[model samples]
Target: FVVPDITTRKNVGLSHDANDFTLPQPLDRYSAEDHATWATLYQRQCKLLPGRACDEFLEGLERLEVDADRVPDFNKLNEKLMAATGWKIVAVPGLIPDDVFFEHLANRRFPVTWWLREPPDVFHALFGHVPLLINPVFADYLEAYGKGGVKAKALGALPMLARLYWYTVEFGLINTPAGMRIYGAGILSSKSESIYCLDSASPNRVGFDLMRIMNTRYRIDTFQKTYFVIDSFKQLFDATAPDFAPLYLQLADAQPWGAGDIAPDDLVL
Candidate 1:
């Protein structure tokens, strides 16, 4: 389903910082229809996420007390989020530079889209991503990932780091005692993926291997063909424990696995 692309031209009136690329959330730009649309997606995801999403994510929604009806005011959300995890959400026009994204994460500030869109954009940014910030381990993992960005940029290994983020933060899964739970923002935000990743047998569910993930390629326009499964948030955080500079050098000549390809070493389930 192609949603109309909301262009940055719509944000011409909004002033963003040249350096960090942050702008104040356009609270007035949201129409009544926008709120209605948010409510619709919000309600739908809420219903679908029950057994699918991790307990932390579901509890985060309650802990942070995100608005279920209207588009949330970032400032209002920030008050509780900061109190919970020392992180705050900032508004941005649309997509920003990779370096800018890393910088935001490094500082524990998440850049969210200031305008409304389908579930994957604004809803994806806030609903999919924000709630997890309440978890101390996941929160620290994100910050460390951001810090890694600076080093990755200098070494021209942004692609490797990007892959790491894509596989982990955006599409990573966890093996809960009950079952595999959705923790990745990308899966949590999309209704189709929320179910397909767990229920469907079409995709490969592999153990989380940091080097394998960094050397993997992913598909942006479709459901993930491989979901990396982490045993715990600590396991996710500990992946970043070692310095990535040497790791990037090692993978410099390595061929990346396709989105749907399972590596020989993958402990596929």
Candidate 2:
């Protein structure tokens, strides 16, 4: 049995490009309730995200003018986004193939899921993720990850690179002189995760390390048992400077570490 929303999924009921898995932004997929859900979530996050969200994430929202009132049009958003960083958001339904996703990011396009769940549908992609693209260094970091993804997939190392993206981009933390902050979309899009990431003592927060991140694992179904703290966005791009092919082969021979395991070499915060 398939779960149905306003749109259907799987082979028979979906519409998208066969290659990229992209389709037009579902303008009508949203109902008044959807917008209300977005609004309610936005209000709550704004209230919650101040000390929690990294300065760049919050600033991008203001510069992009993503609203609390309703979903922002993709084209409307593109005008500002492209001028600022040459990045644009494309709509998709749920997860697309990893190769296709890599290609999108490789070229400065972002594939956003059209329908939402615990979503900001504009919630995570257009809102949480897009804002940071305005930062050149962070934008380059994403593009490099995309470019590396092709290599990772070809080498059977995508899982490793993906873990890095997850720990840093989705659920990563940053250390500032003021305190710890969130730049990861996973935490930024959800109020509870945002609080739990910084305030909770149960999860291990460690400083970022490239190979250690790739060797680690993560869980999407639950609060992360470990979070990595990046010193700055510069480190993210710098980590990508080296070719990962050899590292992929190295890790292929090693047992993948569990999400919560603290590596002996980990610089735990």
Candidate 3:
């Protein structure tokens, strides 16, 4: 991805605060093609997500009342979201520094890239991520992760914290009484991974283990070879409840498990 510098961002009528890298949702940046792309992705994912996506995600779509046909006005969505979970989406030019990203989350503000394309765009951020913010428990989990990110940075253990976010927030799954279902935004917004993550037998499905996840490495360029499963959103909140400084130190000298490797103690599903 060609990350835009400040001048390029300004050329596109985008500007961000130096500290936070936040700007108003460049509402006018989207075109008919962009909206059409959003509509297509929305229609496709919506059709595929049911029975695969966790119940909370489907419910979140309804509760948030996201627009299906076009790019939603972030302010309008913020009103409902704030009422639901005291969270709101802010716009950034693109990906920002880790500290700034965490700072926004620590304050209950989600930084969405104002532009639309698919990845890190309005669709992925607002549709895939924002909906879950309606669930108080999941909302709290995200804020906790944000706070953890701050500490992780100071401790020089940001990579470990990032892996946690990757396995849980981006590509994590939840185990329901019905079966394993997806809650992670990356899978939620993706068309291929959505089906492959659940239906395929090639990947390992392991129960959520905070330290194990922290010690694991994931592939960004392919479908996940393993997915961490949580019994509930509360489980995620509880996992991060303790200080990670010790956890980091404990894993500091240990070798990381490859994306697809299963540990001996893993409670495989």
Candidate 4:
């Protein structure tokens, strides 16, 4: 992913905080092409996502007044987001240490890359992930996930915890009365995935279970081979409420389910 620096935002003696890898959004680094790419991506997803993306996601974009025509000012986006859910977006160069990433969420601040696609992009971070943060129950879940990272990392069970994050935050779904709608940021940001996840029968769709999800394997290079389904965000919050220490220990000696396998215990749809 050879992304343009536009200004000097990329690889220009930039430093990420050792503690959190967060830096100020480099507003000057944006170029016309960057904004143009943003507009193109926004329009494409906007047109494709109506019946697919969860309602809260679309509503967040509207309530936050995110610019469809240009790369939005992060501070401006924060003005609305912070007021709504007490969450804000911070700029990181790209992926950071898992612990640092968790620290940001634990603090109610989301780390968005100043560069694009570069492993997701501003769109993936802000548009895909931020919108759902406005849903209070979901917001609570995220913060809890963040705070729990301490024990996860300490227990050497970060791998399992990460799978939970992957299956849920990145590629999970919800069963709605209308139908199954996507809440995963990874799906919402992706044009192909947004469609394939719902329409494709090739993928395994299982009811969300805390232990089942934490033990599932996922492949990032392709659309998920399995998608976990949750009844509601409340389910997610409640499912994770119990201490994960015992669960993590139990999984240490157990073999994880393969990416595409459907265990008999899975409440397969």
Candidate 5:
């Protein structure tokens, strides 16, 4: 039977503290086919991501030597990760609640989905997402995002924080002297989005604006019509340093920009 929520499980009680979420990955759950799938997905993205993914992300994959042929051991990856940035990967059943997610981030713990996606769904969270943790700037930004969870929770700012995470960590882009490159884990992991995010003329690539993003809406099922681009991780971290209280109140009554709407001042490519 599918594993029930941790709260319902007899052995695993509610994760009272951050470490409670840490669980041994059931390596036996992966079949030989899963290894082949992992290899296939790895090689495919390795070929596609060179020009598309940011340099630091690609370099981290090389430095860590994440298994290109099989699913990675969370324990093994943590050795390099903890040494680099004090961050550790924890396994969870599937998606956890937002508060749990923020709490994990707040504590430098990242929750990864324990189960591999069947054939098509198995892409590259390991290959795409894990590598960037090696970068100090990017790593610091993530930790800051985690620490902000308490403040966000107190001010009823979870939705605002979620937007920041969604726009930057999950689906953000960066403008380099060369051109726009992909940095968001969500974009990095996708097969088609690797191309569509950069090459597609259909989507609007705009400068990163703090309040603008918090008030914007995003869609999961399709390509994003607008992607926010950041100049640097410092820009991302600094933008979130101030109080969001007024901004949250200001946005409370405003209708959000749809996934497709370009703001009046939006700088289009």
Candidate 6:
């Protein structure tokens, strides 16, 4: 599995109430080494992200008052998040089932895995994902994704929805007036990707198209060869406004593009 399993040894016990799945970060479970690791990773990413990460993401990190010295308490963090966008981060064991994840997002509940990385695993989850939640538009997109989950499942198109989330939320980019900026959690969190995503000439940076992304495959173990860039967060929210039932059916038999294949319609940069 790409993520670690920490189902037992509870810092917070697991609970499944009202279709939401959350646990608590046993803040006490973190050792001195863990704190040091977080601090190191945090500082490294922050320095690298200044030119790369979107302004809103950086501002959210400040507005949320995330602890730079230690791991944050989910309850405390949620208080600030709920007030800002009516979104709260819930703790999960690791990657949960798609349905459970979608239900939480559909309801404005964001699931964050509870465990911290010791040495090697530190960069992926914490640094890669959390910073973008501060933007209201991005947060709205997540909630909309969740709200669309039922319709996706009903049409046997959960995979289609997954592609949307993966490309945009997990590994997306943006074309700001300043330049191409990073918004995807996966890219923001990585030490090397923070540099490679913007500087590398090898990858394709294409305009965001809902159906094109849903039909494109992505690489798991390497840097993404293609990234979809939205003109603005509003574009992201507006893109999903249309009913997707027929879109899913239309794509059901369509062969997906290889991870690196660029569609002819792509506005490549």
Residue-wise C-alpha lDDT for candidate 3, range 175-219, written one tens digit per residue:
988999999999998879999999998999999999999999998
lDDT of 1 by residue, 36-97 (tens): 98999899999999989999999999988889999998899999999998999999887889
User: Candidate 1 local accuracy as lDDT?
Assistant: 0.90
The TM-score, computed over Cα atoms with residue i paired to residue i, of candidate 5 is 0.90
Task: Please give the range of 10 consecutive residues that has the lowest summed lDDT in model 6.
Answer: 4-13
Candidate 4 per-residue lDDT, tens place, 1-269, comes to 89655324464867767787888877877788888888989999999999898888899889999899888899998998899889988988887888898888899988888775421778888888888877899999999989888999999988998999899999989999999999999999997999899998788899998888888888889989999999899988887789899999999998989999888788998
List the candidate 1 regions with Cα displacement exceeding 4 Å.
1-5, 118-120
- Residue-wise C-alpha lDDT for candidate 2, range 127-155, written one tens digit per residue: 67888999999999999999988889889
The residue ranges of model 5 lying beyond 4 angstroms of the native Cα positions read: 1-20, 120-124
Name the regions of candidate 3 deviating beyond 4 angstroms: 1-11
Q: Candidate 5: how many backbone clashes?
A: 1
Highest-scoring model, lDDT = 1
259, model 2: CA deviation in Å? 1.1
Task: Quantify how close model 5 is to the true structure by its C-alpha RMSD in Å.
Answer: 3.6
Measured by TM-score, how close is model 2 to the native structure? 0.94
TM-score of each: 0.96, 0.94, 0.95, 0.95, 0.90, 0.91
Off by over 4 Å in 2: 1-14, 118-120
Clashing pairs in 3: none
At residue 105, candidate 4 shows an lDDT of 81
